[PDB]
Structures are given as structure tokens and as C-alpha cells.
Amino acid sequence: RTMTQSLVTLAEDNIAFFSSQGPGETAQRLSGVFAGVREQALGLEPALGRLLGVAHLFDLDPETPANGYRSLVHTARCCLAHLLHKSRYVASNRRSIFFRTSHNLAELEAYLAALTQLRALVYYAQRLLVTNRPGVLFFEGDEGLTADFLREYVTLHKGCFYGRCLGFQFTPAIRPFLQTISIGLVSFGEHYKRNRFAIDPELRGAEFERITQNLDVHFWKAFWNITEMEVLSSLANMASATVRVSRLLSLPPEAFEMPLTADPTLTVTISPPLAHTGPGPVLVRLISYDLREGQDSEELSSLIKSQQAPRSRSLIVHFHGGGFVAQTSRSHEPYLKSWAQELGAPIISIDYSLAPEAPFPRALEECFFAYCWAIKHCALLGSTGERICLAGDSAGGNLCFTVALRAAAYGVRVPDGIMAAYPATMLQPAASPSRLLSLMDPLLPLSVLSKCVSAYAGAKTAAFPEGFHPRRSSQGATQMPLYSSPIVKNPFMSPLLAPDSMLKSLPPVHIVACALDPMLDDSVMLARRLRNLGQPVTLRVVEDLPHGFLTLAALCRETRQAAELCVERIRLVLTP
Amino acid sequence: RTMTQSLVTLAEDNIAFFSSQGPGETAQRLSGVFAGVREQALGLEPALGRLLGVAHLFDLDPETPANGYRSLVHTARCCLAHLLHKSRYVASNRRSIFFRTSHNLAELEAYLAALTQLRALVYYAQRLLVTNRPGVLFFEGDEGLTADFLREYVTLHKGCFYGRCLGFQFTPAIRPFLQTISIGLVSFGEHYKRNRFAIDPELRGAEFERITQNLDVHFWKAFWNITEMEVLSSLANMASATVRVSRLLSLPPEAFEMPLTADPTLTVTISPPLAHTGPGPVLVRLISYDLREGQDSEELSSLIKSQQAPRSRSLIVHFHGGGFVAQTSRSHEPYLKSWAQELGAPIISIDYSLAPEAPFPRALEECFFAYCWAIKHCALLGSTGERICLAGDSAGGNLCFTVALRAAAYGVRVPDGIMAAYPATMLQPAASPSRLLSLMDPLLPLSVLSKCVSAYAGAKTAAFPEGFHPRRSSQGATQMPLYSSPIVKNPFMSPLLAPDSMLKSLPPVHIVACALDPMLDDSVMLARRLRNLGQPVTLRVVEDLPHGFLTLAALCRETRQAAELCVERIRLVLTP
């Protein structure tokens, strides 16, 4: 309340400060800009108040302020505080007209656009809040009305977050990296459309919002694995710790023997990953700190595709992230090598196959085969197998859940821990308050996750009160195929809306996320759907960071303490 | 002897191990490879012994073993130690033929080529030493026969230091960056010729050694200021420290007046810097940690081109480097900001004009004008002028001798100390034992600095015993115009061959250098020409690093303390 009035009480004087000392256009521009600033603050105060009150009404626990409503309120108050600081500075420094009016004119115009767009988004979040039943942050409606809701929200235009104001909601110590990532991605988009703009940030939005609705997942397939090509994969490894064992493996494409815990004398044989195209080489790769006992012999030396540490205690499995479409296992070492420094475990970072050329169930069976091969060939991997741990990543968190839960349907000993960081656990398309901030994020537009589930599932190719009208996206109405066949509503693909009776045997789960991800409301529903069953799950939320910070640890101080947050919670699995 | 004999005692068995266990071509290949290795070591040992004896005979002081002879001896010794370690590993691990013979065949033939080419270079060093008078590091001959020596050097072929073994003489932690850098040059060269190479290192030399002799100075005008563009400068600026004063200036192109310290009552006026094309704006930019007293007023704020810190004690001048053709003042920030953390002085990183469109004296008097303007407008720069400390780089290391001593010709007071990191003080073209290893350096070959003096000067466009026939460069004779008109004989281009009576009034000098630079023999020659006059000059040498590492401070674990060494000797000036 004191933040909103402070912009209003400095309005008329600053309107009178510039309108009385010049008849030019800039006096009218600045007076109208500051009148719009006070009007937007005063009109945005009560909707923010209702949002924060029901956000208190909405969260699962008081310890973790993790909802979409808190994130939208945080974005709005960050914009308001930035406008307040800029206003205080210009008010304290308006003795001369030494500063050019054009620069601050364009800055405050962009911030006017930011405040009016956040006003539209906060009104839409309030509409969703009224429409749904409180207590559930998702929607129970059918496909048609959910698609109508998603199209109605995505009709808005994003000319402010993608221009000069890219990254106001984050730490100021990270913004130049976001700007050069934007420049590089626009550069690849222009180069590949053809098969400068970095000086002027005003024209950055004029392509950064067109790539939101004019992008293909085959084209983002290059983006996650741009850290794979032989110059940057080599140039990203000086921050990586010391190592010796960085060898690939090649598993045989034939089934073997494995027992079940319900009766040790009875075993169950399960076929290799066929997916009606023929089993192939399950390509895994072992990353270990040193050569372990019984590991550097011929049984491991015979499977590489073209002193000794003692008997190990517990191997750590790993599935990479990268949207199930890119970022193979050759990219996650610079924190995987830093993982092995203190854990002391042979980290087999499985490179599972990637969508859409290898969708489910191929993408979920060879990591089911590699996990199955690693309880019996334990000495071949330099491990014992009396205790198993797990790891998860950006997209490989649902795959971290699914392969650790369908094993319980087979009777084989499941692991006793899950460490999935910001997982994509809600691949079923539905509107959500935290998925509303998917059109504004720096690294990914709303179309990253819209076309991620098209690749995985193998798909075949009043609204507003009168007088309120911000800029609207008139660049063609995007009508994409987002149909939900019965192969998408399942734990095996999205383990929330799974039947309740088969989530009881889940391992203990440790999960982290950030407050400003689209993968925030998805992870929040996980805690609510398991705290009513007695199973313990711990969700930790961080702030001022995007999603995709695990491959970005050696960049800033706040990304250091967030990507290291995965490490100390992954070793709680290791104790008996 | 024991390092060379130990390569011989495991030769006959190594031949008997492979030639008696297979009739294929690889047996003859490996036997010939190890015979060539043993004969190259045994024939290169006596030349190395003569070179080390005369290297002990030739250096100035025992404290700093810095010549060309020590550097060539170290290169040969490092190649021999690498081959010895590889032979030890292969001899200990030749129980099976599991390792592919082709890979070690290619590595060992590359090392055979390396030993042959280093043998040719060591023979060239011996012939040079012999020919010239002992005691003088440089040659006293005329232009014609020195050009004959240079061409008789150039006709050699360097197909070994630029292939897979690119960067053996340095630390292994630095080599991946050199590999990506080499990929950068080969991609730049093929793109610039036209207006993949990371998989096969054998084909890397076949383009790199053509790039060496087929590049232009305008081509190299982009490499050093590739960190000047806004995306890479922004991507490098987070490692720098915090700042608030990073403002450019714009000096008036009109003459003004100085006193003389010989007699304060008499006065002298500057002739404005014309270079027969008209005086312009002396672009100088100020870097300071905080706003200082009398600095943020209207006088400084009226010069930007389109609490308060107290009365400062002294300023620090800075001239950038970059071969006089690139690397302007907009590329030296990320370590210049760390300079202001402890020094407590305002850095004026002067952006002087750049060769070849602005040769001497245009590149000489603008920085003379900027230094002259800072003696009088001291408070306007937030200084007092009670002490001048001066800094230098690869190319700016002669600026702290040329314009820092020509002020004493004008009678005005001179700075009380010079810091010059690896200065280029012998721009007159002639060969030396440290200019010998200018064809093997990764980041710049010999045709970089030999063609950067045509830019600065504004130029107008038995040999071997019988049976010794290594690979020779038959790709055209590079008969470039390297004529030396008397404009390079003068003191104000290369101060070693200056008249003796004027270097007496030089300020005290502190110079750092590396043991593997082409600009090594010149920097040790500088201490020779001043230690016989009584003026104290200190020279520090480092190892395992190239020259050009000041912009590469925060990239390796060994360049961190080497670029910190420049700061350590730059604060010794500040004491009275």
C-alpha cells in the first residue's frame, strides 16, 4: 500500500515539472507516461491484494511459498519497485535537462507496457481463480474448454518482457547472459530462416515474440545440445573437476534373468526394448572418480563402442534432461564430475533415446533395460548393488519417477530415493497460474513445452472489462495440434493423475524447483497428491532464477548455490 | 645423458616385440618409428649440449635464465620427455594388441616429425650463434644478408607443432583453449576466403600452416578485437569487478600550454597532432572505482561523446596493446576493473589511434596529447598529478618508452616508473634465437608481428649436412616486402638502437615476460642495454604460457597469478 501510493504522490508534481517548462511533444509524452504510471499502480493494487490473500489461502504448507499466484505477485511488485526506484532517481536528479528525454522516455514507455501487460495477466489469473475450485491449482475440465482457456490466455502480446526489460524479475547479476542468449537464438533463427540488432534493444522484441509462435521442436532440438559440439563441449570442461574414468559402454540387445522381491526363488524374464523396430545398443557411460575394484578388467574393456579403489557401496544412476529431444549424456559432465568429488559413487549417466524419432515406449524401456542391467553386472560397473540411488534433471524427472515406479509393478527391488530437479511431471496440457508465466521467460517461450509433449506422445500432424485494451497479438491465430489421446493420461507419462492405489509403493522423493518456472505448479501438485497418503516428499523452492540452471553452475554466485542444492539432497539417499 | 639413454635401452626389444609378431605393414611402421625416435634422440643430444653450454655462456644474470637458447632447449626437452612417457606407458602396456596400432602409429609419427623439425631449428640456432659475435643477443648485420637468413628460415616447414601436438610446450590445462582457438582461426580463414576440423587433428596443420603464410594484417585486425563486440564483451564482463565510473571523454583538438621543470618561468606550447590530416578528438576513457572529489561536476560531464571519494593522490595512465591494429580500449576492461580494486587510482585507458590508417606520428602524438592534457586538467580527471604511473601491453609496452621518454626531450616532468608487460621493443625486422620459435606458437605465428610493423611504419606495397632432408615448405616462396627505411632506425620506434646519451634520463622500468615468446630476446636485450649504464631495470620471466595472456587472466589456473604479477609490479611505482 505504501509502495503504490509513493508512485501516485510523485505524479502530479512531476507532471507539472515537465509540462510547465516547454510546449514540445516531450512534455505531453512524459506527462501522459507518468499519469499512466500512477493509473496502472492504483488500478493494479486491489487485484494484487486479492491474489496475495487467496495465495495465502492456496498453498500446501506455510514453510514453502510455492504457488503460481505468489510468482505473478512477485513479478508485479518487482516491476513496481523498479519503476519506483527509477522515479525516485529522476525526481532527485531533474535539476537540469542534461539527460536526454528520449532515453528515459523509451525506458518509462517500456515499463508502462510491462505494467499494463502484468495487469492483463493478473486479471486472467483472477479469472482462473474464480472459475476453478480452490484447493487444486489445476483444472478438472475437458480438453475443449481447457484448449479454449489456453488460447484465450495465449492471445495476449508480450512486447515488454522480450524487449529491453528482459530479466527484471531475476538477479541483476545474470541479465547480460540472458541478453546474449537472446542475441544468439535470434541469430540462429535468422540464419536458418535464410537457410546488427544487438545495439538497439527496442527491436529485440520484434523477433523474440515472433519466435514464440513461429518455432518448431526440430529447431529447438539444436538449442539444448549446442553445448555438445566439439568446440564448446571441450571449452566447457575447465570448470569440471579431475577424473580418469569417462568411458562409454554398449549393452547387448538381448534379454537376461532377473528375480522379484516377493519370492527370490521365482524370477521374471522381460523382453529387450523392441518398440516394433528391433532392439539396439543401450548406450550408457560410466563416470567415476577412480578405477574401482573388479572394474578395469576385460569385462568392462570389451564393451567400449568405437592402484584400484575398493569394493564400492552404492552406484548412482542418472538420466539427463533436455526436453526428451536433445542434451544427451555428453553435456552434463561439468557438474557430474563435480558430483563425484564428494559422493564417491560410480555415476552411470544413461543416454536414453530421444523424442520424436524414439518416443515412448522406446524412450522409457532402454533406460528400463539399463537400470535392469545394473543390479546384476554390478562388478562390471564397479559397484555392489546393495543400495541404489537416483538422479533427475530438467525433463528427466518424470523419467526418474516412472522407471522407479514401474519396477515395483514387476517385483524387482526399487530404489529408496528420488532426486528430481524441476521435473516435467504434468505433460498433460492444462492451464495453471504458474504456467501463465510461460510467455515471458528468457530462455523458453510457451512453445517449448507445447511441442515437447507432441514429440513424446508421437502426435500426428467476459474476457476483459470494456475500455481496457493493451497490445494484442494479431500476427495470426496459432491453431496447433494439442490433442490428448488416451496414451497421455497415465502415470507412465504423467504420474500425478495416476490411480492412487499404485503410488503407495513410491520411494521417498526429494524435489527442488524455482519460483519463476513453468515447471512450478506441476511440481507443487506432487506434494499435495502425496501428503494426503502419508508418503513423505520434501519440496524446496528457490527464487530469482530460471529453469535450466543445472547446466549453468559455473556462471554466477546465485546459480552456484542453486545447482549445488541438488548435491546435498542427493546424498541423503546414500545412508541406510 | 640419462634422459636420452633411457630412450635407447628400450629400443631393440620394442622392435623385436612388434616385428617378430606379425608380417603386416604395421610391424615395419612401428619398427621404423622407434628406430627414427632413437636416432633422432641420439643425434639431437650433442646439439642440445652445445646449446645449453652456450646458453650458460650467453645470459646476462643467473637469476633470470631467459634467452632463445634456453627456450629451444626447453622445447626439445619437453618433446623428449613426452616421447619417453609415451614409450614407458606403451612398453608397460603391450601385453595385448587391444589398442589399435593406427592411433599410436599416427601419434608417434607426429612426434617423429616434431623431433625432426626441432632438430632443424636447433641446428639453425647453432649456426646463428656461430656466425654472429658471442656476447650480443642480436645481429649487427645489414638488411640483405639478414633477409637471406630470414628467407632461409621461412623455407622450412612446420607440419608438427600445429597438428595434434599443438601446445605441448605449455601446461596441458591450456591446450583445449588453443584447440578451440585454432578451430576459430581456420573457420575465420575459410569464411574470409569464401567471403568439421575438430574431429581430425591431422588435417588441422594442413590448413593452419597455410593460414600462417596466407594472412593479411586486415585479417588479424579482427581477431584481437573480437572481444570488442558487445556480445563477447558482455559475455566476458561478469568476471570483472564492480564499477560506477566507466565514462569516455572527448578532448578538444586545439593547442595549449605547459611549463618546463627545467625552469618554471619559461613556457612551451604543444604543436597540435596533425599528421598532415587535421587534429581530431583524442578519445580517452576513464575507469575509476568511485566518484572522486571535483570529478563529477559539469567540466567532466560536458565531454561525453554521443558521496564523493576525496582528493586523489595520483593517477595511473594506461595504453592498450593489440599489435597497433586491433584491441582498442573497449577490450581491456575485465582486468582493468580489477586493477582499480587495490591500486586506488583512476585509470585513463587511452584509446590512441591505430595502424595502418593512422601510423606514426598520428599513433604517437595523440597519446602524447592525452598524456600532456592530464598533467594540467588533474582535478577534472579526479586526480592531482603528484605521481604518474604507467602501464603497457604487447604493443603498448614500447609506448611506456617512446612517449614516456620523449617528454624529457620537451623539458616537462616525466613519470617516476614504467610497467611494461612483454614489450615489443625491437620492431626493426631481424632474426634472433627467440624470434626462431615464432613459427611454432599457437595464438600467433611469425607472420603476425612481422607484418604488424609494415602497418606501424606505413610501408608502401652449408645450410644443412648432406642426407638430412626433412619435410620442406614448397608452397611458394613468401617474398614479402620487409624493407627497412631509416624511419625504423629512430629512437621513437625501437629504443634499443637509440643514441646512448638520451636513454640515461629514463624512468625506472619493471618488465615481465614469458619464456616462450617471440618478444623474449628483445626484452632481455633491453636489460642488457641499460645495465651497462647504471639505470636499474628489473626483468621477470614466466614459463609455460604464451604472450597475450593479460586478457586471458581468469581462464586458466596458471595465467591467474601471471597476470596478477603485472599488478604486483605496477604498485611499486606509487611509492616515493
Q: What is the 3-class SS of A334-361, one letter each residue?
A: HHHHHHHHHHCCCEEEECCCCCCCCCCC
Report the C-alpha gap between A527 and A503 in whole angstroms: 13
What is the bridge-based pairing of β-strands B267-269 and A245-248? unpaired
Does A242 lie at the interface with B, CB-CB under 8 angstroms?
Answer: no
A495 and A361 part of one domain = yes
Does A173 lie at the interface with B, CB-CB under 8 angstroms?
Answer: yes
Report the C-alpha gap between B273 and B367 in whole angstroms: 10
CA B513 to mean position of chain CA atoms: 8
Phi-psi region of A548 (alpha: psi -120 to 50; beta: other; left: phi over 0): left
Residue located via cell numbers 538420466: A319
B131 and B241 part of one domain = no
Q: Which three cell numbers stand for residue B373?
A: 592534457
The residue out of A106, A135, A164 marking a domain boundary is A135
Report the C-alpha gap between B102 and B99 in whole angstroms: 9
Selection from B166, B187, B188 nearest residue B175 by Cα: B166
Report the C-alpha gap between A147 and B230 in whole angstroms: 42
The residue out of B135, B150, B184 marking a domain boundary is B135
Dihedral angle of Cα B116, B121, B125, B126, to the nearest 10 degrees: 20
- Find out whether the peptide bond into B356 is cis, omega within 30 degrees of 0: yes
Residue located via cell numbers 514464440: A212
B388 and B251 part of one domain = yes
Report the C-alpha gap between A150 and A156 in whole angstroms: 11
Does B183 lie at the interface with A, CB-CB under 8 angstroms?
Answer: yes
- Are A238 and B556 inside 8 Å of each other by CB? yes
Coil/strand/helix, residue A250? coil
- Tell whether B192 is covered by a domain: no
Distances (CA, A) of A108 to A85, A111, B198: 12, 5, 48
Q: Which residues of A touch B556 (CB under 8 A)?
A: 238
What resolution (Å)?
3.4
The CATH number of whichever domain residue A523 belongs to comes to 3.40.50.1820
Report the C-alpha gap between A69 and A75 in whole angstroms: 10
A394 is catalytic: yes
A40–chain B nearest CA distance, Å: 32
A13 is catalytic: no
Do residues B189 and B211 make contact, with C-beta atoms less than 8 angstroms apart? yes
CA A395 to mean position of chain CA atoms: 8
A388 and A272 part of one domain = yes
Report the C-alpha gap between A531 and A511 in whole angstroms: 14
Q: How many helices (H) and strands (E) does chain A have?
A: 20, 9
Report the C-alpha gap between B31 and B13 in whole angstroms: 10
Residue of A nearest to B172 (CA): A238
Radius of gyration of chain A (CA): 26
What is the bridge-based pairing of β-strands B347-350 and B315-319? parallel
Report the C-alpha gap between A320 and A298 in whole angstroms: 28
E strands in B107-152: none
- Tell whether A99 is covered by a domain: yes
E strands in A195-253: 245-248
- Tell whether A438 is covered by a domain: no
Cβ neighbours for B358, distance < 8 A, ≥ 6 positions apart: B275
Provide the 10 A C-beta neighbour count for residue B42.
14
Phi/psi of residue B60, each to 5°? -80, -50
Q: Which three cell numbers stand for residue B524?
A: 632481455
Report the C-alpha gap between A164 and A203 in whole angstroms: 9
Instruction: Among B180, B238, B301, select the one facing A231 at the smallest CB separation.
Output: B180
For A53-66, give one letter per residue: b (16+ CB within 10 A) or e.
Answer: ebbeebbbeeebbb
Across-strand partners of B373? none
Residue of B nearest to A298 (CA): B98
Interaxial angle between packed helices A12-19 and A68-92, expressed in degrees from 0 to 180 and rounded to the nearest 10 = 40
Q: Which three cell numbers stand for residue A171?
A: 538477479
Do residues A260 and A411 make contact, with C-beta atoms less than 8 angstroms apart? yes
- The residue numbers preceding gaps of C to N over 2.5 A in chain B are 195, 306, 461
The residue out of A135, A163, A183 marking a domain boundary is A135
B547 is catalytic: yes
* Interface residue of A181, A230, A244, A552 to substitute, partner B, most B CBs within 10 Å: A230
Selection from B207, B121, B77 nearest residue B470 by Cα: B121
Q: Which three cell numbers stand for residue A365?
A: 524401456
Selection from A39, A118, A109 nearest residue A77 by Cα: A118
In this structure, what DSSP letter does residue B319 have? E
- Tell whether B479 is covered by a domain: no
- Tell whether A23 is covered by a domain: yes
- Tell whether B215 is covered by a domain: no
Listing DSSP states for B50-80 in one string gives HHHHHHHHH-S-SS---SHHHHHHHHHHHHH
Report the C-alpha gap between B105 and B397 in whole angstroms: 45
Interaxial angle between packed helices A175-193 and A217-224, expressed in degrees from 0 to 180 and rounded to the nearest 10 = 130
Cβ neighbours for A560, distance < 8 A, ≥ 6 positions apart: A553, A554
CA B448 to mean position of chain CA atoms: 10
Report the C-alpha gap between A319 and A134 in whole angstroms: 35
A298 and A407 part of one domain = yes
Coil/strand/helix, residue A285? strand
- Are B176 and A238 inside 8 Å of each other by CB? yes
Among candidate residues A74, A157, A510, A547, the one labeled active-site is: A547
Do residues A78 and A168 make contact, with C-beta atoms less than 8 angstroms apart? yes
Do residues A347 and A292 make contact, with C-beta atoms less than 8 angstroms apart? no
Sign of CA dihedral B549, B553, B555, B558: positive
Report the C-alpha gap between A236 and A123 in whole angstroms: 43
Residue located via cell numbers 635464465: B65
Report the C-alpha gap between A250 and A305 in whole angstroms: 6
Domains: count for chain B? 2
A207–chain B nearest CA distance, Å: 18
State which approach was used to obtain the coordinates. cryo-EM
B418 and B527 part of one domain = yes
Cβ neighbours for A434, distance < 8 A, ≥ 6 positions apart: A67, A68, A71, A137, A517, A518, A520, A521, A522, A524
Report the C-alpha gap between A524 and A432 in whole angstroms: 11
- Tell whether B178 is covered by a domain: no
Q: Which three cell numbers stand for residue A162?
A: 522480450
Residue ranges in A302-409 assigned as alpha helix (H): 333-343, 362-373, 398-402
Distances (CA, A) of B484 to A35, B44, B322, B429, B447: 71, 36, 22, 8, 16
In this structure, what DSSP letter does residue B419 have? E
- Tell whether B300 is covered by a domain: yes
Residue located via cell numbers 616447414: B157
Listing DSSP states for A504-532 in one string gives TTPPPEEEEEETTSSTTHHHHHHHHHHHT
Provide the 10 A C-beta neighbour count for residue B61.
11
Among candidate residues A351, A393, A441, A517, the one labeled active-site is: A517
Dihedral angle of Cα A98, A100, A103, A105, to the nearest 10 degrees: 100
Residue of B nearest to A301 (CA): B98
Radius of gyration of chain B (CA): 26
Residue located via cell numbers 596529447: B369
Phi-psi region of A345 (alpha: psi -120 to 50; beta: other; left: phi over 0): beta
Selection from A436, A435, A448 nearest residue A521 by Cα: A435
Terminal Cα-to-Cα distance of chain A (whole angstroms): 52
Give the 3-state secondary structure percentages of chain A, helix then strand then coil, rounded to 5: 40, 10, 50
Do residues A393 and A316 make contact, with C-beta atoms less than 8 angstroms apart? no
Coil/strand/helix, residue B447? helix
Residue of A nearest to B96 (CA): A298
Domain carrying residue A340: 232-427+484-570
Q: Which three cell numbers stand for residue A273?
A: 526394448
CA B163 to mean position of chain CA atoms: 22
CA B322 to mean position of chain CA atoms: 10
Across-strand partners of A509? A418, A537
Residues listed for chain A = 576
